[PDB]
Subunit: 341 residues, 3 copies
């Protein structure tokens, strides 16, 4: 027992929600214990019911958000149940050495492993499966990716000596999918990941996804699963993309404070319209809602947003501010005396 | 009449030019009145005469640049003449609430609407049509996008307490187009936007444009329409892309001061070769010309620049500086005594 | 002889290595003399032996890294031997005027030219061939691109008044290739660049590379050609991409200090997971190795990394630090008493 620190078990929750944590803490470093269970399963990924052979951490795309503080140790038990067909591992971009932990975590079905990494670098970071060779992109684009947030012990700041505190946090994992089609253009179904591989790899090679989704499917965060907020709340939106670039935008809002490269040692940028998540990274945006109503959160390639699945909704309760925006005149017939050339 | 401020009507001009404005102002906030008239029309988009069914604000791709100051109110009359076939609206990324104004501006042919938004955020911002669902990307990639610049009341600064002033401003709107082809590879023509939709959507879904153009067509800002400047002038180049990333570069020059995310609350970066406009944003670069001659302004995917339409020219008058660059020896035969392995 | 400065001849070396230079210097400005010889040749670009008709500076993809200091003059002799078939030139993104020098350097086979440019802007910069029109992207994606680094005379700094010094430097040139295929999907071979052009241009137009390689071929910097380092060394990794975006990541490491836009007048960002090289630029990352072993350096589109060629290896000698990372329990059977739902 070389490392003599208190241990705290964390119970992960499904995205887009985040497990209970403190922003600022005066507790000393701890060993933060997490469990991730690989689950291969067929999943529905669009509003027409298209299925595909997914591979997940903890049954979700993305995998759950892990939250720790700078100087904590993160002890992760990775479990690969014998119902799975493939070997799996885990690479933490937050971690130092052994390909992020991938070189120390390769497990066959029926096995588990325990990795410990010190949280020396602050920010939001991707984690993903990376078995080796062509299996690396396949496992990642099959769903095996999530994120971890390493907070400064004093919480977030604006890079100019002022504390920032969020009232709410959501984790938006964006997933690029490569679903094979038949000669007529219909999506193909398979009985196992292995059976889907060869056809999937051919789609992957042309670098054009068939779907780009938040929280694992088109429409996942719309309708009854819209994200809630209230006028005045400061909301942190963590966005990850393990394989492909994204350009997040909150329609009707802004990024008040944005860490587009995702690392809290760097001052955020202010007042952004659209920000950029480089493939293989996580970023974070804070926004204080000023108006009630529906907001769309998109990647601002609008073809991907509207036609390939990459739109979420916020439903924000409160009172409308006519000073910031008003409909001066409702739609009305163009006046007869108008000249509109 | 709740809002008791002076009103000023602005007459928009066609890009790449910009309407008359002040950089720094000591005037107080005003209500700045703008009119945008939707025009659906067939337009020529390449040097071989390819046409396509465009949808525009004020008859241009991009729509005109609107320029106001922080704290002004922007009162926009959007007009959809009865000669048009589709409903249209407007989303200002500069604005707060109601999906940028889209939720308050949906008008059928024969209607107009008046929206007012407070200019609380400084920078250059996209505006675009966003009717709903799949119509959002279609209207945007059909040409319905422009930009607005919200200047600080004191004008631009270098983020380190020094004023920056431009001698000239140009607005470069970049447009990704998705023109259908027949089985032989020739571009298809249609009699209406509605007729073009189904085939266009199929091209859009594969996320590869057929054309990438500045000011609405290949060659628009070359030849007799090159952009003018003079040695010593500080030129602001505003660049927008409503749907797709771009990587601007001034061949033979630099970005002296670049706001790649486009927001003046952030200090610019200095001395860039190439900068990055994330899809769904505007950015801005200042450059002081040091040499006369022709400059090419490109997106630095050179296939897009040279082969899909995305090159503009500057023609810069003045005297050559041999200290910065000189041809020491003109092309000459390789000397006989040379060894060139 | 207007310009009365000392002259120093530099002998270039093949990437990923870099010619001998000083980081900080107290020498005054000099005329730094470089020679680049164009070589058109067939080259092997993947592990299955696929060939293609390359065009290079000095026989390598990328062309060699040139290193000078701010205020030096760079006198480049460009040679186009009569064994070549095409005209060639050179555009330095570091240079001011005449399209970066392209407008002063066009040479036919059998000719040479001498260009001098003043190194007024600090950073890493692309150089590339740019003959005119469609020949520009073709020559660049055929291999005619490299980089130059213009160091501050005091060496690198952290943007906060502290010197940074590298123990080692590597230059990683990333190349997007567009190799034609026959109706069965096999790569086509040609006897000359001219013969390959028409088919290559058709691939280029669809903006999807067939290969994305470091140092000119899949596997170039893996196996016996892995990059060496030692625990404790600060390694500068210069990354260029003349045509297409990249997202570098050091698997198991970080970017301690990253200039993603590549320009040393801007403070670096700290502690990045993944950074972004915009097409038509160079960037640079410093990392101090903390753990021994194999590291993969990738573009973090993992399909491109694992399946299209874009992976390099570092082999790092030293002692493992169990505090930063440890395997707490090796892979073992899932305990009978476990519940893993
Ligand atoms: O800021 C640059 C810095 O990163 C360093 C910090 O000095 O270390 C990072 O990783 C180390 C792992 O132990 C820690 O010192 C540090 O707390 C963390 O940010 C150096 O390697 C370098 O100067
Ligand atoms: O996309 C090609 C072509 O395929 C068809 C079926 O023949 O539709 C498929 O592709 C659509 C777009 O991805 C999906 O909306 C649908 O689930 C799928 O069957 C055609 O309708 C389409 O033109
Ligand atoms: O700098 C962060 C800041 O944005 C705020 C300014 O305090 O507001 C922005 O939008 C508001 C709309 O009224 C204005 O206060 C402000 O002038 C503008 O930049 C906050 O919501 C937050 O601190
Ligand atoms: O691009 C496919 C194929 O189509 C042809 C006509 O058969 O040319 C078309 O496409 C060209 C590239 O976009 C355009 O230059 C031209 O306007 C268009 O007819 C072929 O020439 C080409 O191989
Ligand atoms: O920092 C902005 C600055 O770039 C300037 C420097 O004043 O010049 C750059 O190019 C010039 C070429 O002579 C040099 O003055 C300078 O050393 C270099 O960084 C201006 O044109 C402008 O303020
Ligand atoms: O990629 C299309 C198709 O072509 C084949 C040969 O018919 O393989 C070629 O393409 C592969 C992927 O790029 C390469 O691995 C190989 O060198 C090449 O012959 C098929 O195997 C493949 O499905
Ligand atoms: O140690 N107190 O939270
Ligand atoms: O299945 N993912 O939220
Ligand atoms: O672990 N690879 O399928
Ligand atoms: O109020 N004067 O410009
Ligand atoms: O048609 N646009 O400039
Ligand atoms: O308004 N949509 O076509
Ligand atoms: O001038 N001395 O290095
Ligand atoms: O051939 N290039 O390293
Ligand atoms: O110089 N062009 O082939
Ligand atoms: Cu896996
Ligand atoms: Cu990774
Ligand atoms: Cu419209
Ligand atoms: Cu938008
Ligand atoms: Cu060339
Ligand atoms: Cu260039």
């Amino acid at each position: 027992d070389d490392l003599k620190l208190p241990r705290q078990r964390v119970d992960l929750v499904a995205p887009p929600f985040v497990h209970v944590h403190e922003q600022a803490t005066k507790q000393g470093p701890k060993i933060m214990e997490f469990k991730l269970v690989v689950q291969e399963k067929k999943m529905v990924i669009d509003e027409k019911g298209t299925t595909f052979q997914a591979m997940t951490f903890n049954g979700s795309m993305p995998g759950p958000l892990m939250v720790v503080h700078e100087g904590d140790y993160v002890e992760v038990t990775l479990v690969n149940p014998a119902t799975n067909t493939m070997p799996h591992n885990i690479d933490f971009h937050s971690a130092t050495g052994a390909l992020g932990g991938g070189a120390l975590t390769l497990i066959n079905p029926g096995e588990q492993v325990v990795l410990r990494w010190k949280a020396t670098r602050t920010g939001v970071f991707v984690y993903h499966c990376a078995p080796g060779g062509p299996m690396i992109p396949w496992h990642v684009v099959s769903g095996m990716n999530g994120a971890v947030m390493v907070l400064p012990r004093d919480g977030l700041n604006d890079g100019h000596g002022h504390s920032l505190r969020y009232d709410r946090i959501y984790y938006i994992g964006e997933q690029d999918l490569y679903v094979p089609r038949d000669e007529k253009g219909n999506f193909k179904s398979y009985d196992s990941p292995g059976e889907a591989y060869s056809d999937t790899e051919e789609v992957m090679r042309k670098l054009t996804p068939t779907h780009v989704v938040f929280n694992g499917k088109a429409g996942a965060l719309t309708g009854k699963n819209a994200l809630n907020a209230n006028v005045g709340e400061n909301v942190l939106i963590v966005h990850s993309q393990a394989n492909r670039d994204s350009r997040p935008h909150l329609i009707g809002g802004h990024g008040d404070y944005v860490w587009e490269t995702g690392k809290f040692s760097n001052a955020p940028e202010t007042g952004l319209e659209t920000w950029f998540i480089r493939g293989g990274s996580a970023g974070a945006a804070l926004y204080k809602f000023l108006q009630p109503g529906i907001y769309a959160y998109v990647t601002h390639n609008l073809i991907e947003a509207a036609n390939l699945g990459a739109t979420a909704h916020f439903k924000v309760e409160g009172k409308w501010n006519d000073d910031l925006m008003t409909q001066v005149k409702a739609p009305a017939d163009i006046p007869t005396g108008s000249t509109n050339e």
